[PDB]
Amino acid sequence: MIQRTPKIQVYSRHPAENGKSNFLNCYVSGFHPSDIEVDLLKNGERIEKVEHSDLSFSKDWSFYLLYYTEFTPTEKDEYACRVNHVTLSQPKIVKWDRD
Amino acid sequence: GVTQTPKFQVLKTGQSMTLQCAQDMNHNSMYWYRQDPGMGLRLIYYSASEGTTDKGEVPNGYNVSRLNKREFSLRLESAAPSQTSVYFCASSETDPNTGELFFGEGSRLTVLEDLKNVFPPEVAVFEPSEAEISHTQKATLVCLATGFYPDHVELSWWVNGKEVHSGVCTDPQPLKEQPALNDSRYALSSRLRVSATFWQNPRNHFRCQVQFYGLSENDEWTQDRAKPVTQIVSAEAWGR
Amino acid sequence: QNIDQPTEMTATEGAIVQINCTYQTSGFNGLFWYQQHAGEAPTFLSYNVLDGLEEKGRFSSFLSRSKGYSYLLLKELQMKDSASYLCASIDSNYQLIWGAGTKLIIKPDIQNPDPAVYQLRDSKSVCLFTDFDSQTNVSQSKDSDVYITDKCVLDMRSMDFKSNSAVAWSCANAFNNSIIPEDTFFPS
Amino acid sequence: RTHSLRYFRLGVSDPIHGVPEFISVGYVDSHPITTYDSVTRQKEPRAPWMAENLAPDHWERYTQLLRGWQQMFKVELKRLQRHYNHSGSHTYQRMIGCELLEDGSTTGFLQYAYDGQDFLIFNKDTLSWLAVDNVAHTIKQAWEANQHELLYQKNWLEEECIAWLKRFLEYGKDTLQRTEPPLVRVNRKETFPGVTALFCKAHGFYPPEIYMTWMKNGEEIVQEIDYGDILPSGDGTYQAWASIELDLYSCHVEHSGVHMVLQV
């Protein structure tokens, strides 16, 4: 049984500018099987107001999802996306590279 | 394949009825249709697979149960005269079906306001005309089953205790005795043609048998005349 | 939409019959032909979804998608072919729509007609109009207390003999509402 | 413009962590239009323009079908697991659909996957199934014996699917047939000493299809180009990028019949 680990991409809706209101996105794709757990973090702490797309299907048989939240980027704030999947021994925290 | 019960039933308005249907073909999909003159089969209810059922085109007054993979019952909780019809159960491997739809034998249901209009047939055999025998060297016996209600009869000919099919013609449908009346009684005819040599043998015995489907043991009867139960009414004739 | 097929069709024994069916203008997932003898369950004949003619013994089913029609072709007709033929089609939502059915009547080829009206007496009266040719039609009498049955075809399989017959009951006046052969025998 | 209609089915044996045993989703291009799962046991629209044009009575027939299809999937996956001598949780997948291309021509496809790998691929031109292994070969023989089902699928792929696609394109025209041009920029930066990185970044575009390339003196680059995925921005628009390491460079962007050049 071949299992495919998720591709995790953390980016903002618009080009990031310190002090300007934006949306932080976490796009999780190319995973198989479908059971997955995603959380968006602000300084290691899980964000409550997080919206997401329903589980989606790709032509290559894998799945994708988009998790997003409204945020105002600042120099002092660290953002990440924590993903859990069967292919992972521990949850994978993927930090936002700040655009 | 598809086993459907009962073939015949007379109900009084308000009575409950369950139509049974079973298939041993491991089919997923089951259906209940009704057939009425002048129109195409109409779906009452269907079951796409075990664990699901849904309304068809004509669900009002009926309900269903997909009891298991094999069985699909049709219930009439309070029978109404409009429910008088021919009911067919059917099954297909899956839904949508592109293959054979397998039908049950059919259930003929009659719903009446009063069972007082139910009558068994009067049966009579008309011996062949001497002019026919002399002119064609053939002899035609005519059987008449008259005064029955509802139109649920099966006519058969028996020669010397054995059922015959060769040389027989039975009317496919009975004719209404009072055409203008909604509750008219019915009449049916059949002919059996034998050679004159066969008719002229005095040892030959001919019998017309009419099977009638009417009331059952559980039906309450209060009239002076005999209870018009499911019965066999015959008439016999001997040769020459 | 609608599934349209003729109510009734009449053809002669041994000849060819084509039963047409025009279907729904919206959505198509296939067309079926079913056979149904009087008092019997419908039985499957064919399923067509693409264009062409599918042949299965004496029966062929044609489908034209562009023209929106199908036909059931019956060759070398037999008396056993007397039945109703039901057309049904699957729509865009996979729902089966049934046509009202086409009743097929087969006229037997009567080799030696001998039309006659006989009077039959009970074994405990009735008039028999028999041995007439298949072109002869039997009308229903206007008289309320006179009962007349439609033409019935009998087969004496041991003698390869077929005959048409009608029964009347309430003699020379019994079949007066129907056009009967001029050569009809009226015994005394 | 090219458009597609797709229906997927996903089956899971022995699911854990709230995962449904069965999911079915329909799409028009990138957009979900319909959803069904083994929890809801109901087919529902997933786009406002589907709900607005199809009466709740339309989904009634699809609910029944999907319940039947959910049951067949459960049975088929149990059979597949037996053939492979497999225990535990395994997945079964189906994809059916069609594309209406720009030139007016069409495509249709029907495929199955066991554990996310190709299993059976339908060939509507020869009316046959292409099998990856001997277990698939066994299924292929059982399915190929049913001539009626095969002709029905070819018809559905070529005719019905296209008629549905065209109908859904009309319902969702304000979404599906719109064009939002890209906002493109070129950023230049010195990375490792001596190494200059040029990034061509596009955002705010719809449809997601975009062609982004780097050219050197009007001709194509024989050096390594890095490509960013076309990503959803979360507002119905997309973003993408392309980078090169500068050793006269220009970024060429094509989107919906509009060509755009950004020289460095």
Tab-separated table of N, CA, C and O in Angstrom, chain B residues 33 35 38-41 88 95-101 103-105 108 124-129 131-132 135-136 138 140-142 144 146 165-172 175-178 187 189 191-195 236-237, chain C residues 29 32 34 36 38-44 47 86 90 94 96 98-100 114 116 118-126 128 130-131 140 144 147-158 161 163 165-167 169 185 187:
chain	number	residue	atom	x	y	z
B	33	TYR	N	-45.245	-1.666	-9.003
B	33	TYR	CA	-45.985	-0.959	-10.045
B	33	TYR	C	-47.455	-1.313	-9.973
B	33	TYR	O	-47.820	-2.379	-9.499
B	35	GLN	N	-50.800	-1.462	-12.823
B	35	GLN	CA	-51.176	-1.423	-14.216
B	35	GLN	C	-52.684	-1.221	-14.345
B	35	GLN	O	-53.472	-1.997	-13.803
B	38	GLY	N	-55.417	1.665	-20.427
B	38	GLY	CA	-55.196	2.912	-21.147
B	38	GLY	C	-53.952	3.656	-20.749
B	38	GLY	O	-53.673	4.738	-21.276
B	39	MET	N	-53.199	3.104	-19.819
B	39	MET	CA	-51.997	3.795	-19.397
B	39	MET	C	-50.846	2.855	-19.175
B	39	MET	O	-51.032	1.648	-19.032
B	40	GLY	N	-49.663	3.431	-19.149
B	40	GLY	CA	-48.431	2.714	-18.880
B	40	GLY	C	-48.320	2.384	-17.410
B	40	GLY	O	-48.996	3.001	-16.566
B	41	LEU	N	-47.487	1.388	-17.098
B	41	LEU	CA	-47.251	0.992	-15.721
B	41	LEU	C	-46.864	2.247	-14.943
B	41	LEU	O	-46.160	3.114	-15.471
B	88	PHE	N	-47.799	-5.297	-9.924
B	88	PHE	CA	-46.617	-6.071	-10.266
B	88	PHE	C	-45.458	-5.622	-9.433
B	88	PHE	O	-45.192	-4.419	-9.317
B	95	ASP	N	-29.670	-0.043	-9.898
B	95	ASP	CA	-30.384	1.159	-10.293
B	95	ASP	C	-29.376	2.297	-10.648
B	95	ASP	O	-28.540	2.629	-9.797
B	96	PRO	N	-29.394	2.925	-11.861
B	96	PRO	CA	-30.265	2.642	-13.027
B	96	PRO	C	-30.014	1.275	-13.671
B	96	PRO	O	-28.887	0.791	-13.770
B	97	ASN	N	-31.109	0.636	-14.044
B	97	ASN	CA	-31.121	-0.664	-14.688
B	97	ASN	C	-31.026	-0.490	-16.215
B	97	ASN	O	-31.809	0.251	-16.791
B	98	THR	N	-30.057	-1.177	-16.842
B	98	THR	CA	-29.835	-1.242	-18.302
B	98	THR	C	-30.079	-2.685	-18.781
B	98	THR	O	-29.950	-2.978	-19.966
B	99	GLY	N	-30.340	-3.583	-17.812
B	99	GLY	CA	-30.604	-4.992	-18.046
B	99	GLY	C	-32.070	-5.343	-17.866
B	99	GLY	O	-32.959	-4.476	-17.851
B	100	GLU	N	-32.321	-6.631	-17.704
B	100	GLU	CA	-33.659	-7.159	-17.531
B	100	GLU	C	-34.300	-6.765	-16.191
B	100	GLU	O	-33.703	-6.891	-15.116
B	101	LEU	N	-35.529	-6.284	-16.275
B	101	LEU	CA	-36.370	-6.026	-15.122
B	101	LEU	C	-37.174	-7.341	-15.005
B	101	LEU	O	-37.712	-7.832	-16.002
B	103	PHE	N	-40.242	-9.411	-13.485
B	103	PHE	CA	-41.560	-9.176	-12.892
B	103	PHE	C	-42.138	-10.386	-12.197
B	103	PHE	O	-41.938	-11.524	-12.643
B	104	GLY	N	-42.883	-10.129	-11.120
B	104	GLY	CA	-43.663	-11.138	-10.421
B	104	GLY	C	-44.885	-11.464	-11.277
B	104	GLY	O	-45.170	-10.772	-12.268
B	105	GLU	N	-45.619	-12.507	-10.910
B	105	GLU	CA	-46.772	-12.962	-11.671
B	105	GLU	C	-47.983	-12.003	-11.705
B	105	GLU	O	-48.842	-12.155	-12.579
B	108	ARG	N	-54.083	-9.380	-8.619
B	108	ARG	CA	-55.325	-8.733	-9.009
B	108	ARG	C	-56.148	-8.407	-7.800
B	108	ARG	O	-56.630	-9.304	-7.109
B	124	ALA	N	-72.472	-23.272	-17.849
B	124	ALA	CA	-73.269	-24.157	-18.695
B	124	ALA	C	-72.552	-24.547	-19.995
B	124	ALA	O	-71.849	-23.724	-20.595
B	125	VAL	N	-72.712	-25.812	-20.403
B	125	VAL	CA	-72.135	-26.383	-21.624
B	125	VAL	C	-73.242	-26.553	-22.678
B	125	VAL	O	-74.304	-27.126	-22.406
B	126	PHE	N	-72.995	-26.010	-23.865
B	126	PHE	CA	-73.921	-26.081	-24.982
B	126	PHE	C	-73.409	-27.116	-25.950
B	126	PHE	O	-72.292	-26.979	-26.468
B	127	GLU	N	-74.182	-28.213	-26.102
B	127	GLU	CA	-73.796	-29.332	-26.960
B	127	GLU	C	-73.720	-28.970	-28.445
B	127	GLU	O	-74.479	-28.116	-28.898
B	128	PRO	N	-72.780	-29.574	-29.209
B	128	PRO	CA	-72.665	-29.233	-30.639
B	128	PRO	C	-73.931	-29.407	-31.458
B	128	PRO	O	-74.734	-30.304	-31.218
B	129	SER	N	-74.084	-28.517	-32.435
B	129	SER	CA	-75.173	-28.479	-33.395
B	129	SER	C	-75.016	-29.679	-34.340
B	129	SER	O	-73.906	-29.923	-34.826
B	131	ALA	N	-76.283	-29.852	-37.295
B	131	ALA	CA	-76.007	-29.244	-38.597
B	131	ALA	C	-74.489	-29.023	-38.802
B	131	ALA	O	-73.994	-29.289	-39.899
B	132	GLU	N	-73.745	-28.597	-37.742
B	132	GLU	CA	-72.290	-28.402	-37.807
B	132	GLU	C	-71.570	-29.711	-38.079
B	132	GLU	O	-70.710	-29.759	-38.959
B	135	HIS	N	-72.239	-30.840	-41.687
B	135	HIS	CA	-71.613	-29.923	-42.642
B	135	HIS	C	-70.081	-29.937	-42.611
B	135	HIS	O	-69.462	-29.785	-43.666
B	136	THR	N	-69.464	-30.049	-41.420
B	136	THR	CA	-67.999	-29.954	-41.319
B	136	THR	C	-67.241	-31.173	-40.781
B	136	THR	O	-66.009	-31.184	-40.847
B	138	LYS	N	-66.894	-31.818	-37.696
B	138	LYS	CA	-66.305	-31.234	-36.489
B	138	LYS	C	-67.450	-30.870	-35.564
B	138	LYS	O	-68.574	-30.658	-36.030
B	140	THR	N	-68.394	-28.424	-32.052
B	140	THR	CA	-67.995	-27.375	-31.117
B	140	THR	C	-68.885	-27.354	-29.878
B	140	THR	O	-70.107	-27.244	-29.981
B	141	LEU	N	-68.258	-27.446	-28.713
B	141	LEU	CA	-68.914	-27.348	-27.416
B	141	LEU	C	-68.665	-25.918	-26.942
B	141	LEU	O	-67.578	-25.374	-27.146
B	142	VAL	N	-69.692	-25.272	-26.401
B	142	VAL	CA	-69.561	-23.892	-25.940
B	142	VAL	C	-69.805	-23.848	-24.462
B	142	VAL	O	-70.794	-24.402	-23.988
B	144	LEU	N	-70.304	-21.393	-21.173
B	144	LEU	CA	-70.633	-20.043	-20.732
B	144	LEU	C	-70.552	-19.955	-19.212
B	144	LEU	O	-71.192	-20.747	-18.530
B	146	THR	N	-71.472	-17.207	-16.510
B	146	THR	CA	-72.239	-15.944	-16.448
B	146	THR	C	-72.494	-15.476	-15.022
B	146	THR	O	-72.325	-16.255	-14.082
B	165	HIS	N	-55.862	-28.546	-24.170
B	165	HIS	CA	-55.500	-27.202	-24.656
B	165	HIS	C	-55.695	-27.077	-26.148
B	165	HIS	O	-55.971	-25.988	-26.651
B	166	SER	N	-55.553	-28.203	-26.848
B	166	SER	CA	-55.734	-28.285	-28.291
B	166	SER	C	-57.214	-28.133	-28.643
B	166	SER	O	-58.064	-28.814	-28.050
B	167	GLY	N	-57.491	-27.236	-29.588
B	167	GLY	CA	-58.839	-26.989	-30.064
B	167	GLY	C	-59.687	-26.149	-29.137
B	167	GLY	O	-60.915	-26.156	-29.265
B	168	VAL	N	-59.047	-25.412	-28.208
B	168	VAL	CA	-59.725	-24.559	-27.230
B	168	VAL	C	-59.557	-23.074	-27.547
B	168	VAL	O	-58.467	-22.638	-27.886
B	169	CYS	N	-60.627	-22.294	-27.376
B	169	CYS	CA	-60.589	-20.846	-27.469
B	169	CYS	C	-61.397	-20.247	-26.384
B	169	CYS	O	-62.613	-20.413	-26.366
B	170	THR	N	-60.726	-19.555	-25.468
B	170	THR	CA	-61.369	-18.841	-24.388
B	170	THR	C	-61.198	-17.349	-24.652
B	170	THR	O	-60.114	-16.905	-25.009
B	171	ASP	N	-62.269	-16.583	-24.458
B	171	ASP	CA	-62.238	-15.127	-24.598
B	171	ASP	C	-61.183	-14.555	-23.650
B	171	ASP	O	-61.099	-14.976	-22.486
B	172	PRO	N	-60.323	-13.646	-24.130
B	172	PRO	CA	-59.267	-13.124	-23.247
B	172	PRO	C	-59.823	-12.281	-22.106
B	172	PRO	O	-59.279	-12.298	-21.005
B	175	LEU	N	-67.118	-10.122	-20.853
B	175	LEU	CA	-67.928	-8.975	-21.206
B	175	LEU	C	-68.845	-8.593	-20.041
B	175	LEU	O	-69.268	-9.483	-19.295
B	176	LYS	N	-69.094	-7.274	-19.866
B	176	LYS	CA	-69.978	-6.699	-18.855
B	176	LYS	C	-71.423	-7.038	-19.245
B	176	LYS	O	-71.843	-6.755	-20.375
B	177	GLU	N	-72.187	-7.625	-18.299
B	177	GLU	CA	-73.591	-7.972	-18.536
B	177	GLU	C	-74.513	-6.760	-18.538
B	177	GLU	O	-75.453	-6.724	-19.334
B	178	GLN	N	-74.222	-5.740	-17.706
B	178	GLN	CA	-74.982	-4.477	-17.700
B	178	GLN	C	-73.954	-3.348	-18.052
B	178	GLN	O	-73.443	-2.696	-17.139
B	187	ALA	N	-69.575	-12.004	-17.985
B	187	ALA	CA	-69.806	-13.260	-18.668
B	187	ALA	C	-68.582	-13.620	-19.540
B	187	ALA	O	-67.891	-12.724	-20.031
B	189	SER	N	-66.927	-16.755	-22.398
B	189	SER	CA	-67.210	-17.894	-23.234
B	189	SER	C	-65.946	-18.597	-23.647
B	189	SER	O	-64.859	-18.008	-23.719
B	191	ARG	N	-64.802	-22.162	-26.302
B	191	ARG	CA	-65.190	-23.180	-27.280
B	191	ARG	C	-64.150	-24.288	-27.228
B	191	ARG	O	-62.975	-24.020	-26.952
B	192	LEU	N	-64.585	-25.532	-27.453
B	192	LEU	CA	-63.724	-26.688	-27.574
B	192	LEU	C	-64.217	-27.425	-28.803
B	192	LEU	O	-65.372	-27.872	-28.859
B	193	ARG	N	-63.362	-27.486	-29.813
B	193	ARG	CA	-63.695	-28.169	-31.051
B	193	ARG	C	-63.011	-29.514	-31.119
B	193	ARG	O	-61.791	-29.619	-30.953
B	194	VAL	N	-63.823	-30.550	-31.313
B	194	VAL	CA	-63.378	-31.932	-31.430
B	194	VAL	C	-63.916	-32.452	-32.749
B	194	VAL	O	-64.825	-31.827	-33.307
B	195	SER	N	-63.383	-33.589	-33.247
B	195	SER	CA	-63.911	-34.189	-34.474
B	195	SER	C	-65.293	-34.810	-34.177
B	195	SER	O	-65.560	-35.171	-33.031
B	236	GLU	N	-70.757	-30.365	-17.174
B	236	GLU	CA	-70.272	-31.488	-17.956
B	236	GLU	C	-71.265	-31.895	-19.028
B	236	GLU	O	-72.454	-31.543	-18.944
B	237	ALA	N	-70.774	-32.622	-20.046
B	237	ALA	CA	-71.547	-33.152	-21.164
B	237	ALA	C	-70.891	-34.424	-21.666
B	237	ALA	O	-69.660	-34.551	-21.668
C	29	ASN	N	-31.173	7.786	-21.616
C	29	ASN	CA	-30.239	6.801	-21.090
C	29	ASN	C	-30.590	5.380	-21.508
C	29	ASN	O	-30.066	4.417	-20.942
C	32	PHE	N	-36.243	0.420	-23.782
C	32	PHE	CA	-36.569	-0.987	-23.614
C	32	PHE	C	-37.830	-1.372	-24.349
C	32	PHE	O	-38.749	-0.567	-24.477
C	34	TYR	N	-40.667	-4.531	-23.949
C	34	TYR	CA	-41.205	-5.614	-23.130
C	34	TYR	C	-42.373	-6.207	-23.855
C	34	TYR	O	-43.064	-5.482	-24.589
C	36	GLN	N	-45.932	-8.495	-23.311
C	36	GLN	CA	-46.870	-8.867	-22.268
C	36	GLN	C	-48.068	-9.577	-22.838
C	36	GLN	O	-48.940	-8.930	-23.422
C	38	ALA	N	-51.757	-11.314	-22.524
C	38	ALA	CA	-52.965	-10.997	-21.751
C	38	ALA	C	-53.020	-11.877	-20.480
C	38	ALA	O	-52.893	-13.104	-20.578
C	39	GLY	N	-53.129	-11.232	-19.312
C	39	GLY	CA	-53.157	-11.901	-18.011
C	39	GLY	C	-51.793	-12.340	-17.500
C	39	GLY	O	-51.707	-13.021	-16.483
C	40	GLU	N	-50.709	-11.958	-18.186
C	40	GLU	CA	-49.349	-12.362	-17.794
C	40	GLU	C	-48.471	-11.171	-17.419
C	40	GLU	O	-48.852	-10.022	-17.629
C	41	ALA	N	-47.319	-11.443	-16.817
C	41	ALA	CA	-46.367	-10.401	-16.471
C	41	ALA	C	-45.615	-9.926	-17.722
C	41	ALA	O	-45.425	-10.720	-18.670
C	42	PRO	N	-45.116	-8.661	-17.737
C	42	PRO	CA	-44.270	-8.248	-18.867
C	42	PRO	C	-42.947	-9.025	-18.849
C	42	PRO	O	-42.436	-9.363	-17.761
C	43	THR	N	-42.405	-9.353	-20.035
C	43	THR	CA	-41.087	-10.021	-20.128
C	43	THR	C	-40.191	-9.166	-21.010
C	43	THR	O	-40.645	-8.643	-22.023
C	44	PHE	N	-38.925	-9.050	-20.638
C	44	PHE	CA	-37.915	-8.268	-21.345
C	44	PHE	C	-37.633	-8.766	-22.772
C	44	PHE	O	-37.370	-9.946	-22.973
C	47	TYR	N	-32.925	-3.843	-24.938
C	47	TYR	CA	-32.491	-2.527	-24.447
C	47	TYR	C	-31.623	-1.929	-25.533
C	47	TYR	O	-30.746	-2.610	-26.015
C	86	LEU	N	-44.729	-3.195	-24.807
C	86	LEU	CA	-44.466	-2.002	-24.005
C	86	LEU	C	-43.098	-1.432	-24.284
C	86	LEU	O	-42.095	-2.133	-24.233
C	90	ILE	N	-35.445	5.640	-20.408
C	90	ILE	CA	-34.789	6.216	-19.236
C	90	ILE	C	-34.449	7.680	-19.526
C	90	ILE	O	-33.805	7.972	-20.540
C	94	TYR	N	-32.391	9.281	-14.748
C	94	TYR	CA	-32.446	7.815	-14.668
C	94	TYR	C	-33.807	7.250	-14.274
C	94	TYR	O	-33.898	6.138	-13.747
C	96	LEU	N	-37.381	5.692	-15.257
C	96	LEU	CA	-38.018	4.916	-16.301
C	96	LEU	C	-39.426	5.436	-16.593
C	96	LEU	O	-40.220	5.578	-15.684
C	98	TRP	N	-42.838	4.762	-18.876
C	98	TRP	CA	-43.511	3.726	-19.644
C	98	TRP	C	-44.528	4.233	-20.629
C	98	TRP	O	-45.321	5.079	-20.282
C	99	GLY	N	-44.504	3.666	-21.834
C	99	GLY	CA	-45.516	3.883	-22.861
C	99	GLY	C	-46.758	3.087	-22.484
C	99	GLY	O	-46.669	2.135	-21.685
C	100	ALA	N	-47.930	3.459	-23.043
C	100	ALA	CA	-49.199	2.773	-22.700
C	100	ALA	C	-49.334	1.349	-23.277
C	100	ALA	O	-50.277	0.638	-22.931
C	114	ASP	N	-65.702	-21.438	-44.512
C	114	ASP	CA	-66.992	-22.095	-44.605
C	114	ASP	C	-67.930	-21.386	-43.596
C	114	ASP	O	-68.392	-22.017	-42.640
C	116	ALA	N	-70.679	-20.076	-41.229
C	116	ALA	CA	-71.950	-20.623	-40.785
C	116	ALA	C	-72.316	-20.103	-39.410
C	116	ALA	O	-71.440	-19.713	-38.629
C	118	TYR	N	-74.593	-21.500	-36.268
C	118	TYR	CA	-75.236	-22.678	-35.688
C	118	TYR	C	-75.927	-22.366	-34.375
C	118	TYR	O	-75.479	-21.488	-33.648
C	119	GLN	N	-76.983	-23.124	-34.049
C	119	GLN	CA	-77.695	-22.986	-32.788
C	119	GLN	C	-77.311	-24.175	-31.918
C	119	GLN	O	-77.448	-25.328	-32.354
C	120	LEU	N	-76.821	-23.885	-30.691
C	120	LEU	CA	-76.375	-24.879	-29.716
C	120	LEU	C	-77.327	-24.966	-28.516
C	120	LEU	O	-77.686	-23.937	-27.917
C	121	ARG	N	-77.723	-26.202	-28.157
C	121	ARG	CA	-78.627	-26.455	-27.042
C	121	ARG	C	-77.863	-26.871	-25.794
C	121	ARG	O	-76.878	-27.611	-25.888
C	122	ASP	N	-78.324	-26.402	-24.623
C	122	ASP	CA	-77.734	-26.715	-23.316
C	122	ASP	C	-77.806	-28.216	-23.021
C	122	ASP	O	-78.770	-28.881	-23.412
C	123	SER	N	-76.769	-28.729	-22.322
C	123	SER	CA	-76.629	-30.119	-21.881
C	123	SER	C	-77.430	-30.428	-20.573
C	123	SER	O	-77.393	-31.569	-20.093
C	124	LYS	N	-78.176	-29.422	-20.028
C	124	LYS	CA	-78.997	-29.523	-18.811
C	124	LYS	C	-80.349	-28.795	-18.922
C	124	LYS	O	-80.835	-28.509	-20.015
C	125	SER	N	-80.436	-21.356	-25.019
C	125	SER	CA	-79.673	-21.491	-26.271
C	125	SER	C	-78.485	-20.516	-26.452
C	125	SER	O	-78.339	-19.541	-25.705
C	126	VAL	N	-77.638	-20.814	-27.468
C	126	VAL	CA	-76.444	-20.077	-27.869
C	126	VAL	C	-76.282	-20.194	-29.392
C	126	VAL	O	-76.577	-21.249	-29.963
C	128	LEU	N	-73.497	-19.835	-32.570
C	128	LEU	CA	-72.084	-19.917	-32.909
C	128	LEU	C	-71.832	-19.515	-34.356
C	128	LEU	O	-72.296	-20.186	-35.280
C	130	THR	N	-69.078	-19.317	-36.944
C	130	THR	CA	-67.778	-19.952	-37.067
C	130	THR	C	-67.346	-20.148	-38.504
C	130	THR	O	-68.173	-20.074	-39.421
C	131	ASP	N	-66.032	-20.445	-38.680
C	131	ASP	CA	-65.394	-20.804	-39.948
C	131	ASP	C	-65.386	-19.697	-41.006
C	131	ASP	O	-65.183	-19.960	-42.196
C	140	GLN	N	-70.683	-5.444	-31.905
C	140	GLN	CA	-71.433	-5.679	-30.672
C	140	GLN	C	-72.865	-5.237	-30.965
C	140	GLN	O	-73.056	-4.139	-31.494
C	144	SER	N	-79.667	-4.548	-25.760
C	144	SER	CA	-79.253	-4.636	-24.353
C	144	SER	C	-79.228	-6.057	-23.776
C	144	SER	O	-78.310	-6.396	-23.022
C	147	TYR	N	-75.915	-10.679	-25.882
C	147	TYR	CA	-74.494	-10.674	-25.573
C	147	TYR	C	-73.744	-11.309	-26.684
C	147	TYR	O	-74.112	-12.399	-27.107
C	148	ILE	N	-72.746	-10.586	-27.224
C	148	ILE	CA	-71.888	-11.029	-28.328
C	148	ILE	C	-70.408	-10.855	-27.956
C	148	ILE	O	-69.986	-9.773	-27.539
C	149	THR	N	-69.630	-11.919	-28.143
C	149	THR	CA	-68.204	-11.977	-27.821
C	149	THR	C	-67.384	-11.632	-29.053
C	149	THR	O	-67.828	-11.901	-30.178
C	150	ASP	N	-66.176	-11.092	-28.856
C	150	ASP	CA	-65.278	-10.777	-29.973
C	150	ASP	C	-64.784	-12.091	-30.655
C	150	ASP	O	-64.918	-13.166	-30.068
C	151	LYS	N	-64.219	-11.993	-31.878
C	151	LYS	CA	-63.621	-13.120	-32.623
C	151	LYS	C	-62.553	-13.793	-31.754
C	151	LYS	O	-61.737	-13.096	-31.137
C	152	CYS	N	-62.561	-15.129	-31.715
C	152	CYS	CA	-61.580	-15.932	-30.987
C	152	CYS	C	-61.014	-16.914	-32.008
C	152	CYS	O	-61.781	-17.411	-32.845
C	153	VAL	N	-59.687	-17.203	-31.954
C	153	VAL	CA	-59.056	-18.142	-32.883
C	153	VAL	C	-58.721	-19.459	-32.199
C	153	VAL	O	-57.975	-19.498	-31.223
C	154	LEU	N	-59.264	-20.542	-32.733
C	154	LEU	CA	-59.016	-21.867	-32.197
C	154	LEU	C	-58.110	-22.662	-33.114
C	154	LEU	O	-58.218	-22.535	-34.330
C	155	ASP	N	-57.193	-23.443	-32.527
C	155	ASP	CA	-56.243	-24.258	-33.269
C	155	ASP	C	-56.358	-25.751	-32.939
C	155	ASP	O	-56.090	-26.166	-31.811
C	156	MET	N	-56.748	-26.554	-33.933
C	156	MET	CA	-56.831	-28.007	-33.792
C	156	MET	C	-55.502	-28.501	-34.319
C	156	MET	O	-55.357	-28.779	-35.513
C	157	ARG	N	-54.493	-28.469	-33.425
C	157	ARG	CA	-53.094	-28.810	-33.683
C	157	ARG	C	-52.858	-30.198	-34.284
C	157	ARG	O	-51.859	-30.385	-34.987
C	158	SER	N	-53.770	-31.160	-34.029
C	158	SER	CA	-53.659	-32.523	-34.569
C	158	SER	C	-54.011	-32.580	-36.063
C	158	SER	O	-53.557	-33.482	-36.757
C	161	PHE	N	-55.371	-27.230	-38.268
C	161	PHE	CA	-56.562	-26.500	-38.637
C	161	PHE	C	-56.831	-25.350	-37.684
C	161	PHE	O	-56.769	-25.505	-36.457
C	163	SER	N	-59.627	-22.003	-36.945
C	163	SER	CA	-60.932	-21.411	-37.207
C	163	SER	C	-61.239	-20.218	-36.313
C	163	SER	O	-60.831	-20.170	-35.141
C	165	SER	N	-64.241	-17.800	-34.599
C	165	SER	CA	-65.576	-17.995	-34.029
C	165	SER	C	-65.983	-16.890	-33.081
C	165	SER	O	-65.151	-16.309	-32.385
C	166	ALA	N	-67.279	-16.595	-33.080
C	166	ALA	CA	-67.936	-15.632	-32.195
C	166	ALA	C	-69.152	-16.345	-31.577
C	166	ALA	O	-69.741	-17.229	-32.216
C	167	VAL	N	-69.508	-15.983	-30.337
C	167	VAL	CA	-70.639	-16.568	-29.615
C	167	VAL	C	-71.665	-15.457	-29.317
C	167	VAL	O	-71.288	-14.341	-28.941
C	169	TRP	N	-75.701	-14.845	-27.410
C	169	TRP	CA	-76.762	-15.395	-26.567
C	169	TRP	C	-77.685	-14.308	-26.033
C	169	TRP	O	-77.272	-13.153	-25.974
C	185	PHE	N	-73.862	-19.946	-44.194
C	185	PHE	CA	-74.793	-21.057	-44.071
C	185	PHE	C	-75.692	-20.890	-42.845
C	185	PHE	O	-75.202	-20.759	-41.715
C	187	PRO	N	-78.452	-23.107	-41.341
C	187	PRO	CA	-79.253	-24.347	-41.320
C	187	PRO	C	-80.633	-24.168	-40.658
C	187	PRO	O	-80.809	-23.251	-39.853
